[PDB]
Design a protein around this nucleic acid. Structure first.
Ligand SMILES: Nc1ncnc2c1ncn2[C@H]1C[C@H](O)[C@@H](COP(=O)(O)OP(=O)(O)OP(=O)(O)O)O1
Ligand SMILES: Nc1ncnc2c1ncn2[C@H]1C[C@H](O)[C@@H](COP(=O)(O)OP(=O)(O)OP(=O)(O)O)O1
Ligand SMILES: [Ca+2]
Ligand SMILES: [Ca+2]
Ligand SMILES: [Ca+2]
Ligand SMILES: [Ca+2]
Ligand SMILES: [Ca+2]
Length: 341
DNA sequence: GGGGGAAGGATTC
DNA sequence: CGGAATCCTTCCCCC
């Protein structure tokens, strides 16, 4: 089996450049402003010029202006990045049939019935890696290996504007030389946990006992790391369909007043329904982020689809159920819809 | 014991 | 310090 992985480079910031070439060369920073005050939000993306000075996704806009006060701060425009993304996907879908769109900027192509030999694949990369830019002017990275995971790991290493292959021999070298923190699916919390057990390489997962491991990262996660280490990881490429659509907003003031919240919650719902498009959800969750950034949320599932009217109706019950089962003040409130018909 | 889910909390990105 | 979506873990009804 041969998996080819494409990943659009510094995507949001890269699109704002295609749309405004002048920016190419200068530090660009796409961010999300909440509203509580001027320049209050987080950074979503930054091109490499901005990154090499310490600006990366996740940090406070304030903390970034204090580093590159003279950088171009642009507001995020997801609807645009989504359309540009959709065109390229369709552009990718002309190489394989077996295709898995992971996110707005990633995709896995099972280029197996279209190719052989790694060399034959690599070439296919430089190809894809070139039609995209010809037609859309976007630069991407390609990674290719035996399974989904190593193909990604490859692309991570080989970025930016790269292409790279990890044959079966190189995989073996990695299963024992690569930091676990760098395995897809593993994050800060689970990462800073495997240490507490004495694991830093995929290979370690074989030493530790299954029950010990199973109890810090989880049974699913555990089985996942073991499989990669035994080199038994092999998941078919496929589809993936949004199983949930929702929206959350930050209120100008943290509050516990049902009347104050209601308007923000209703804005979330109306926005949510628009995105639902022609999909009927049978479940709904009200979601709230406390001021210490916790997330609490109550939902209800229905034996049939939900109408905006029922949605407006039920959400208020859920918003209360919450306000009761807890004590903290609310900062952000929103809704999520799932179990589509 | 465990299927089959709904409901609640935690993570990754 | 923002926001979207998924991912895991527990509780329940019952054969
Ligand atoms: N806290 C966050 N809030 C909003 N969006 C975020 C946040 N953290 C990360 N992201 C988004 C922005 C990007 O779409 C994406 C980052 O993807 P990434 O695949 O790691 O590639 P890269 O190193 O080439 O640059 P880029 O990340 O921007 O695409 O996730
Ligand atoms: N909750 C989740 N747990 C694990 N993987 C997820 C989750 N949600 C989404 N993904 C997957 C599918 C996404 O397309 C993919 C990655 O999104 P993304 O912004 O690219 O990069 P990344 O997670 O790959 O880390 P990096 O910052 O190095 O690029 O992760
Ligand atoms: Ca990317
Ligand atoms: Ca990506
Ligand atoms: Ca990254
Ligand atoms: Ca990592
Ligand atoms: Ca990232």
């Amino acid at each position: 089996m041969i998996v080819l992985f494409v990943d659009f480079d510094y995507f949001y910031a890269q699109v704002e450049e295609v749309l405004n070439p002048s920016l190419k060369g200068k530090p660009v920073v796409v961010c999300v402003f909440s509203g509580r005050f001027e320049d209050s939000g987080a950074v979503a993306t930054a091109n490499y010029e901005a990154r090499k000075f310490g600006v990366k996704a996740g940090i406070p806009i304030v903390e970034a202006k204090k580093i590159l006060p003279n950088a171009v701060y642009l507001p995020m425009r997801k609807e645009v990045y989504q359309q540009v993304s959709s065109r390229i996907m369709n552009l990718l879908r002309e190489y394989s049939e077996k295709i898995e769109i992971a996110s707005i900027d990633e995709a896995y192509l099972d280029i197996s019935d279209k190719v052989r030999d790694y060399r034959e694949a690599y070439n296919l990369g430089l190809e894809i890696k070139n039609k995209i830019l010809e037609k859309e002017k976007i630069t991407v990275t390609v990674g290719i290996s035996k399974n989904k995971v190593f193909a990604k790991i490859a692309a991570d290493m080989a970025k930016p504007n790269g292409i790279k292959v990890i044959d079966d021999e190189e995989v073996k070298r990695l299963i024992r030389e690569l930091d676990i923190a760098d395995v897809p699916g593993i994050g800060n919390i689970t990462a800073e946990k495997l240490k507490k057990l004495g694991i830093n390489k995929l290979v370690d997962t074989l030493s530790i006992e299954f029950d010990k491991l199973k109890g810090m990262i989880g049974e699913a996660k555990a089985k996942y790391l073991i499989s990669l280490a035994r080199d038994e990881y092999n998941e078919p490429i496929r589809t993936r369909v949004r199983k949930s659509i929702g929206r959350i907003v930050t209120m100008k003031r943290n509050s516990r007043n049902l009347e104050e919240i209601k308007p923000y919650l209703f804005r979330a719902i109306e926005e949510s329904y628009y995105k639902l498009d022609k999909r009927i959800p049978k479940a709904i969750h009200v979601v709230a982020v406390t001021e210490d950034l916790d997330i609490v949320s109550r939902g209800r599932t229905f034996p049939h689809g939900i109408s905006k009217e029922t949605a407006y109706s039920e959400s208020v019950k859920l918003l209360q159920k919450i306000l009761e089962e807890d004590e903290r003040k609310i900062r952000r409130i929103g809704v999520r819809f799932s179990k589509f018909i």
